[PDB]
């Protein structure tokens, strides 16, 4: 009861014995006395499908964005910057392109200048090395410095290129009378980087696709009562996105950044002028027989 959270591990089947993937236990918000309740923040599971430990910028495809959620006043909790699902959008697809970021000390030794093209294994500091090859740019912060370099092929338009107009945008693969373009089977992000006041470069970077499935809501997870009592608990499944459109994730050392996490929502449906349903009290009830036991949350109002 040290923390108000419990991890229920889901056992894996015997069909996977080559990948040692960690089973993301269902994380539930449990009370100190283990007596939780419905109509509150239910259990959540961090899906490993869209979890990456490399810093990446994600952009969602253009769609209908009608925010059906008014602004909620911020409630400070000991100045703890927890992860809040500020973008609960039914996004069909998005493109995330990785990048390499180094947050070196302000007084640390830097060997690479800003906006300098460096290859792999470029020692930017005394004990800091590289992982890819790109044009790394360095910016000085209040107490540190940041070096950023996203893997991309460099190019310069020469009297025949039509890619100058598209800047910092991801374009899907196009096959329309391409008599000179080959191996363009994947979407590429074109960025117009200002190398100099009179010379600019174009960076074509690989992009990784990420889609979302259809959420199934259990609106009939209870039996029809014979006492004509309305069930005030409705359980639904949804997805929570860490970053919004065109947002770059910051990754700490040995830290896996998650893009989408499964969430469970408990809501209510109360009639008018019949009964003002306020809340209910729940606990865990058990019953065992025939070498099998039943485990479910018993919620009575």
């Amino acid at each position: 009861k040290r923390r108000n959270r419990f991890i229920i591990p889901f056992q894996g089947s015997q069909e996977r014995k080559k990948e040692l993937m960690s089973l993301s236990g269902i994380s539930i918000e449990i009370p100190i006395n283990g007596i939780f309740r419905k109509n509150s923040i239910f259990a959540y599971f961090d899906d490993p499908r869209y979890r990456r430990k490399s810093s990446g910028i994600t952009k969602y495809g253009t769609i209908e964005m009608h925010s059906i959620v008014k602004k909620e006043d911020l409630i400070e909790y000991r100045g703890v910057k927890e992860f809040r699902p500020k973008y609960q959008m039914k996004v069909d697809r998005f493109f995330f392109i990785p990048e390499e970021v180094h947050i070196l000390a302000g007084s640390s030794s830097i060997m690479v200048r800003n906006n300098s093209i460096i290859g792999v294994d470029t020692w930017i500091t005394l004990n800091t090395r590289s992982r890819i090859g790109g044009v790394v740019r360095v910016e000085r912060k209040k107490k540190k410095i940041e070096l950023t370099i996203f893997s991309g092929d460099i190019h310069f338009p020469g009297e025949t290129d039509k890619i100058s107009r598209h800047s910092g945008i991801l374009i899907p693969p196009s096959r329309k009378n391409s008599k000179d373009s080959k191996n363009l089977k994947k979407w590429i992000y074109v960025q117009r980087i200002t190398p100099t006041k009179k010379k600019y470069f174009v960076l074509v970077r690989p992009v990784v696709p990420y889609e979302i499935t259809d959420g199934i809501n259990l609106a009939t997870l209870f039996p029809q009562d014979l006492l004509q009592e309305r069930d005030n608990v409705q359980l639904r499944v949804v997805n929570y996105i860490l970053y919004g459109n065109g947002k770059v994730t910051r990754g700490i050392s040995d830290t896996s950044i998650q893009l989408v996490r499964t969430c469970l929502v408990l809501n209510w449906n109360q009639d008018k002028k019949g009964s003002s349903i306020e809340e209910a009290r729940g606990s865990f009830v058990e019953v065992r027989t025939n070498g099998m036991i039943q485990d479910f949350l018993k919620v009575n109002l």
Partner: protein
């Protein structure tokens, strides 16, 4: 509960058993049968919940003394402590602690209550 049953059947009983037995019966059973009637009140937002565990109540030894209760015009009473937490449906938490509901006056050896430095007695009704 029952004391020696042959009281009033073999000797003249003490002229206090009415008030004394009434107060003891109250302390023993009325507290339980009234705390259970306390509801499970809460908010309409499905966000908070209040609970009062019933089989945890107890009283505390009075702070002041009867002589000092009548000396400073105070009220001889004992504090009622019931263990019960508060449930928040925001992180699904329940903070459990023992609270002080209030103060209840106590009878002395005379069968009376000392309220505001005044001896008071309760008259039976038919």
């Amino acid at each position: 509960m029952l004391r020696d049953g042959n009281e009033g059947m073999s000797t003249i009983p003490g002229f206090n058993q009415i008030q004394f037995e009434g107060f003891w019966r109250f302390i023993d059973q009325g507290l339980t049968e009234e705390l259970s009637k306390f509801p499970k009140m809460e908010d309409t937002d499905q966000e908070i919940e209040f609970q009062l565990f019933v089989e945890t109540y107890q009283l505390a030894e009075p702070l002041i003394k009867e002589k000092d209760a009548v000396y400073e015009s105070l009220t001889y009473s004992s504090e009622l402590y019931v263990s019960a937490g508060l449930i928040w449906k925001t992180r699904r938490e329940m903070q459990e602690q023992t609270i002080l509901i209030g103060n209840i006056p106590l009878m002395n050896s005379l069968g009376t209550f000392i309220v505001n430095g005044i001896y008071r007695i309760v008259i039976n009704q038919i």
